Write a protein that binds this ligand. Structure first.
Ligand SMILES: CC(C)(COP(=O)(O)OP(=O)(O)OC[C@H]1O[C@@H](n2cnc3c(N)ncnc32)[C@H](O)[C@@H]1OP(=O)(O)O)[C@@H](O)C(=O)NCCC(=O)NCCS
Ligand SMILES: CC(C)(COP(=O)(O)OP(=O)(O)OC[C@H]1O[C@@H](n2cnc3c(N)ncnc32)[C@H](O)[C@@H]1OP(=O)(O)O)[C@@H](O)C(=O)NCCC(=O)NCCS
Lengths: 128, 128, 123, 103
């Protein structure tokens, strides 16, 4: 239902993603989480194009082990907390078996033009 | 001394920082916080080069109002709670009088080569 | 005839301790977009510029910290096209030289339009 | 060398296409990968340094897109070399990068 792994994306880190001390910069993690989230929403008939859509209100990451080039990583994604307009999404970042990072993003649905929160769509509601 | 404003960075957003939705992409915020912080460490005569240095162990941001090109934004940074190896830095990012975001970063001091926790610099200790 | 000065971000560097080369194109792009915005040419509108060619010469590597200056000029005016130069100096040293050929087209219509006269005034 | 990959949505700028610098990121990554295959790493004291780089934009790339980069050594100087990265979407050539590299 809700807190199950609903999306798994595997990909490779670019060497230029690393900063001057030789590991992937922290913002790139949020880029990764971004692509995984967007891909899953793509799976769910939810688009960035429409008049109304999701916006990140909060996002966070816990770094347990550093990632160095080259590395093949897997992201396991689950959605946990649904408000009326808000939702929480979790991203687990693995290198091989080893778990490298923890992402948590609070996303809100809004009318982009009117920058006001709008309630959450039914298709995610169906994950109960 | 501690939760006092210890760094203030004012700058203009780059157009290329915006995503396909016509406002600044979320990771770019973490770039901003990262550079403000690094400038402050520079202010404490701390540079990223030495045998010992800061490592982000946690980072988070709350986005209150969207940012569009062009915009002049200010980051106000304070250090709030100090451990032996860890510290937290808070960032308020305003466009003019309005608050766009609030960032929280937990940083740990380590020996980079050995990947081990190391105590906080004394120059950081002076803010108590 | 235009100079944008700024400070290098530490995160612009790659794992080899120098500003990444693509980041230069980000810099030049920002200088160009800035200068066009100053002349009230905006990225928002239905019609706008599209870069068809861009190039950079790397003379000296840039390391954090560095305060750099970009000097942007349009050297050659076509009818629909233009050539713009962005030279990146760190104080007395010239660090990089970028050259971009730019044409104006309609994003919606995917079609050519002649040059504005105000750009002709950058001569 | 042939590197195929997929475009990230965040690679796009506010105009709905891949930002121009990211192409140089792509080319650079293809180069580094080929070097990795030939057991050449930037870690060592000796390595290639790009002195010139250029790109011609022929057709815009929109998300999603599966792109193939074909990279070859074009011209060998004594210290210099020219390297080409042609970026194709399927059969269509989308961009062409040319970089002059020395050691
Ligand atoms: C969304 C936004 C307009 C506020 O909308 P709103 O109409 O005022 O309604 P809310 O503030 O209550 O936001 C909705 C949810 O965000 C949550 N939220 C609000 N403040 C929060 C905070 N400081 N931290 C974490 N979550 C928060 C609320 O719990 C709320 O949950 P709900 O669905 O149960 O009501 C504002 O956050 C915003 O400007 N977002 C833009 C997003 C952005 O800047 N970048 C995203 C990438 S484009
Ligand atoms: C930072 C790091 C080396 C510490 O490793 P560790 O096994 O957690 O060692 P410790 O548990 O002793 O951590 C020590 C400090 O970090 C804190 N900490 C440890 N584990 C934590 C966790 N899971 N979550 C949040 N904080 C944690 C501790 O409170 C402690 O702070 P203190 O000195 O004030 O008491 C490790 O977490 C790591 O590899 N992080 C990613 C490295 C990196 O590249 N960061 C850059 C961002 S990309």
């Amino acid at each position: 239902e809700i807190n199950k792994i609903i999306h798994k994306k595997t990909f490779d880190i670019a060497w230029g993603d690393m900063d001057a001390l030789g590991h992937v910069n922290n913002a790139r993690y949020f880029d990764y989480f971004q692509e995984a989230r967007i891909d899953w929403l793509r799976e769910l008939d939810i688009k960035m194009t429409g008049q109304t859509g999701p916006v990140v209100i909060h996002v966070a990451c816990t770094f347990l082990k550093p990632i160095v080039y080259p590395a093949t990583v897997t992201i396991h994604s689950k959605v946990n907390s649904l408000g009326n307009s808000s939702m929480i999404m979790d991203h687990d970042l693995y290198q091989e078996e080893t778990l490298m990072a923890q992402g948590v993003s609070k996303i809100v649905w809004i009318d982009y033009t009117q920058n006001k929160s709008v309630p959450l769509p039914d298709i995610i509601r169906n994950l109960v």
